[PDB]
Design a protein around this ligand. Structure first.
Ligand SMILES: *CC[C@@H](C(N)=O)[N+](C)(C)C
Ligand SMILES: [Mg+2]
Ligand SMILES: [Mg+2]
Ligand SMILES: [Mg+2]
Ligand SMILES: [Mg+2]
Ligand SMILES: [Mg+2]
Ligand SMILES: [Mg+2]
Ligand SMILES: [Mg+2]
Ligand SMILES: [Mg+2]
Ligand SMILES: [Mg+2]
Ligand SMILES: [Mg+2]
Ligand SMILES: [Mg+2]
Ligand SMILES: [Mg+2]
Ligand SMILES: [Mg+2]
Ligand SMILES: [Mg+2]
Ligand SMILES: [Mg+2]
Ligand SMILES: [Mg+2]
Ligand SMILES: [Mg+2]
Ligand SMILES: [Mg+2]
Ligand SMILES: [Mg+2]
Ligand SMILES: [Mg+2]
Ligand SMILES: [Mg+2]
Lengths: 55, 134, 165, 182, 145
RNA sequence: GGAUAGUGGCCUACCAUGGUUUCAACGGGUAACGGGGAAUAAGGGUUCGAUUCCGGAGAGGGAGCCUGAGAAACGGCUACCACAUCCAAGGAAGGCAGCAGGCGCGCAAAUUACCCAAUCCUAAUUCAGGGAGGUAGUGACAAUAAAUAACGAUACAGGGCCCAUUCGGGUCUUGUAAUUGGAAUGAGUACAAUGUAAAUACCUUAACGAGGAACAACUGGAGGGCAAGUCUGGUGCCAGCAGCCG
């Protein structure tokens, strides 16, 4: 088509039943801990969204 | 248990209004709310006023129950309390009666329908009865 | 704009009137008899629209067809240098078109399953039935394009700009 | 037409949005002192910056002459009562260096945590919002209340509600009825 | 050097007349002082403009990129002027349809072309009282025909 | 001199030829009512001010006037234009830029609600009235304050480690599990009394009111500018995104 072809032509994957990420302060409590408290592993430099280790 | 610990701040005695006007600081230790009929009993015994002459308003408790800060008047007499106080306060207590009257817009419609005519309405009614044949 | 909004303001006045749009891009006003519609179009030009209505009676339509399969023989050339294309035309039976109208056969249907229905039930070569892309014009409607032939390397890019053309 | 009740967009955003180290540094603050928003931080930063702005506009003039001396002192008086500024430092030029971290540690948020009661910080914010905690004999459910240093000692659990021990915690009325049934 | 401009304690006028009459080469100030916004600029110097979709156009874009952009010639209601509005997102001129009231917006650039769409200065927002993004994402549905 | 309450080229007679101007007269424009102020915010500034106060104007236009201390009034009148009502065709009545409402315009803006109890105002006036004014409704214009769980235990992992013949107790502290368990909470309803002109709502509570299915956070973004995907399926110069780069 020549009018929104891609929007139709994709297989719609359905919203998975994944648990509620908490709102307000408890959300901050994650982000505080997922940077400052827990401290992620670093080979050279820090990284906030990792990759599965591959090319 | 609670005891409705009433207090009576800022007693400004007033011969011009024939009353002691004041704030009513009040308490609820474990009770919730004081209520007004219960207050005027407690103001009657305290000031030797009787429920009739006591008139209290405002209040609105602080927060966490705790406290309530009224605005209690105690008149010199019941007849004195009747002729000074605005009518709505006399309705609250059950002293005076609620004034049964027509709606505001109906009063204005009745004002203007009355403004539209001139003189007495007996003249226009007799003319209206004569127009039934016409 | 003053018409359109008035036209909507008429359609709600009278229970009958339907103010739809023709498929050739023309406003239309329905009217139970013909008196009624002269009343509506008197009321619409005043009152509702408040604008002089330039009137005509319809458009309407029409669809062409292809009737007889020529199997022959016109060939392309676009501009120079270029390639070429080719030609033929059918028509496919009205049983097929009816399904494309109805929405039993779709543009967003399974390539293999739709093609097996086409070949068995409706008279087709199953390979050619897979090799159709479009149901023009554009997403829906009973016009088709099919890819026969073998060989030629980079057909897949132009195949889509054939479909689009 | 009584009068326009004035207000302020009090608490005001920084002049870039994505200074990475600020985005972390603000998280650090909202994690340490348990703040639901960036707002809660900027609130303090501005509220503070207003003071700073005075201090600068007083220190421009000679301390010895009047306003400098009076408004400055009153500005200090205000801070020492609110308890941000130390009793070591009452010298106006020290007000200039007050910082956001010192302001937050003075809130009712924190002075719950610093007096025990809660354990684990956030719990206080939850206790405060959940109508326990009375600074005077008066409940406070604003976490960001600013404690008066003088009143710090008076922070206790409320006369009403649990923890003070008037009524235990609203699943007792379930299980006292359930245990009575058995 | 004296540095061009006068420096007298009583100059002022030869500053204040000079800065009136240089400003005029500041394109911000010129549009404000001459009402190009009002006298031109299809929208009447206004955020937006409702305008009836006269036709769904496909506009072949400028170079580097290559795509037909799927736009709409409009007829702005108030002025009676005709403009060309872009229609954002996959298809969605499908959602626009034909002879609809279409609310427009500036594209962003204070007039001017947004990127590669040559001669289109506007985005559709509301088609006959919705919002294209609400249609495109399908959180909201169109009010039938 | 005339007029005006009065000063005056305010008007009239007769006389003189002045008056302003590149220190912008005059003219034009203004999507100009002036000021207070507003936003921005080192300093200097720019832009905005229809809009809660103070002036000024206007009551469809433009005139003219009655009464009156005060009107060139328009919730007074006379007229003409412009617009329109009501008719028994002879003639009548009009002026929301008060409030509410509707059309129209437009990107663009509320209920023909309840009240004088406040605030004040007016009169022959304690006693009447007041869409001035207040009271709600609608209200993501703005602005202020902040819920979207918390504490356990058991069950599987991280951290300190009495000692590291290999273990490991785990004596001490943290994170994960549709485990599970006790303890609250206004979001709501509702006698009451508050509140209130009467009500609502707020603050206060008799009585009920949480267990993941509930009593559910969206918006935008995820190459750079600029915070953060080389995840899984499609897509395949298209369709699209993209302020700019792309
Ligand atoms: C771009 C040149 C041209 C040619 N090779 O002749 N075309 C292939 C026809 C486009
Ligand atoms: Mg309580
Ligand atoms: Mg080229
Ligand atoms: Mg004279
Ligand atoms: Mg003007
Ligand atoms: Mg101005
Ligand atoms: Mg003004
Ligand atoms: Mg204007
Ligand atoms: Mg005024
Ligand atoms: Mg008008
Ligand atoms: Mg007049
Ligand atoms: Mg008037
Ligand atoms: Mg009027
Ligand atoms: Mg009006
Ligand atoms: Mg609005
Ligand atoms: Mg009003
Ligand atoms: Mg509302
Ligand atoms: Mg609540
Ligand atoms: Mg998202
Ligand atoms: Mg993405
Ligand atoms: Mg980055
Ligand atoms: Mg995007």
């Amino acid at each position: 088509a020549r009018a929104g072809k891609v929007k139709s032509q994709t297989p719609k994957v359905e919203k998975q039943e994944k648990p509620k990420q908490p709102k307000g302060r408890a959300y901050k409590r994650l982000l505080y801990t997922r940077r400052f408290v827990n401290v992620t592993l670093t080979n050279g430099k820090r990284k906030m969204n990792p990759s599965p280790s591959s090319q | 248990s609670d005891a409705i610990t009433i207090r009576t701040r800022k007693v400004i005695s007033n011969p011009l209004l024939a009353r002691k006007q004041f704030v009513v600081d009040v308490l609820h230790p474990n009770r919730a709310n004081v209520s007004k009929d219960e207050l005027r009993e407690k103001l009657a015994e305290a000031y030797k006023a009787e429920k009739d002459a006591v008139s209290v308003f405002g209040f609105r408790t602080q927060y966490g129950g705790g406290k309530s800060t009224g605005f209690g008047l105690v008149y010199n007499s019941v007849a004195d309390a009747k002729k000074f106080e605005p009518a709505y306060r006399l309705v609250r207590y059950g002293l005076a009666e609620k004034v049964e009257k027509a709606s505001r817009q109906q009063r204005k419609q009745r004002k203007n329908r009355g403004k539209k005519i001139f003189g007495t309405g007996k003249s226009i009614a007799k003319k209206a009865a004569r127009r039934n044949a016409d | 704009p003053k018409l359109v909004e008035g036209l909507k303001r008429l359609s709600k006045s009278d229970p009958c009137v339907l103010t739809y749009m023709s498929e050739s891009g023309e406003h239309i006003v329905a009217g139970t008899g013909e008196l009624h519609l002269e009343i509506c179009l008197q009321d619409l030009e005043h009152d509702h629209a408040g604008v002089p209505l330039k009137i005509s009676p319809p458009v309407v339509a029409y669809r062409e067809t292809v009737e007889s399969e020529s199997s022959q023989t016109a060939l392309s050339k676009s501009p120079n240098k270029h390639n070429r294309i080719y030609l033929k035309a059918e028509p496919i039976d009205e049983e097929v078109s009816l399904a494309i109208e109805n929405g039993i056969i779709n543009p967003r249907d399974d390539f293999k399953a739709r093609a097996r229905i086409m070949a068995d039930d409706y008279g087709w070569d199953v390979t050619d039935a897979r090799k159709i892309w479009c149901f023009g014009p554009d997403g829906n409607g009973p016009n088709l394009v099919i890819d026969q032939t073998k060989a030629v390397q980079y057909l897949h890019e132009i195949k889509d700009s054939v479909v689009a053309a | 037409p009584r009068a326009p009740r004035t207000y302020s967009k009090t608490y005001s955003t920084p002049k870039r949005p994505y200074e990475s180290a600020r985005l972390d540094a603000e998280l650090k603050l909202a994690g340490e002192y348990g703040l639901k928003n960036k707002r809660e931080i900027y609130r303090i930063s501005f509220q503070l910056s207003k003071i700073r702005r005075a201090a600068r506009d007083l220190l421009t003039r000679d301390e010895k002459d009047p306003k400098r001396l009076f408004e400055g002192n009153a500005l200090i008086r205000r801070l020492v009562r609110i308890g941000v500024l130390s009793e070591d430092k009452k010298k106006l030029d020290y007000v200039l260096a007050l910082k956001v971290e010192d302001f937050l540690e003075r809130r009712l948020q924190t002075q719950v945590y610093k007096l025990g009661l809660a354990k684990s910080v956030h719990h206080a914010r939850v206790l405060i919002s959940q109508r326990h905690i009375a600074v005077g004999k008066q409940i406070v459910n604003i976490p960001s209340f600013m404690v008066r240093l003088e009143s710090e000692k008076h922070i206790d659990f409320a006369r009403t509600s649990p923890f003070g021990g008037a009524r235990p915690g609203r699943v007792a009325r379930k299980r006292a009825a359930a245990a009575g049934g058995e | 050097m004296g540095k061009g401009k006068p420096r007298g304690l009583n100059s002022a006028r030869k500053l204040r007349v000079h800065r009136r009459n240089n400003r005029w080469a500041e394109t911000t100030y010129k549009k404000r002082l001459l009402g190009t916004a009002f006298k031109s600029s299809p929208f009447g110097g206004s955020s937006h403009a409702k305008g009836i979709v006269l036709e769904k156009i496909g506009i072949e874009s400028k170079q580097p990129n290559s795509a037909i952009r799927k736009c709409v010639r409009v007829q702005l209601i108030k002025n009676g002027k005709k403009v060309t509005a872009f229609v954002p997102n996959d298809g969605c001129l499908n959602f626009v349809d034909e002879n609809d009231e279409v609310l427009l917006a500036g594209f962003g650039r204070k007039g001017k072309a947004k990127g590669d769409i040559p001669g289109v200065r506007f985005k559709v927002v509301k088609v006959s009282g919705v919002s294209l993004l609400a249609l495109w994402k399908e959180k909201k549905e169109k009010p039938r025909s």
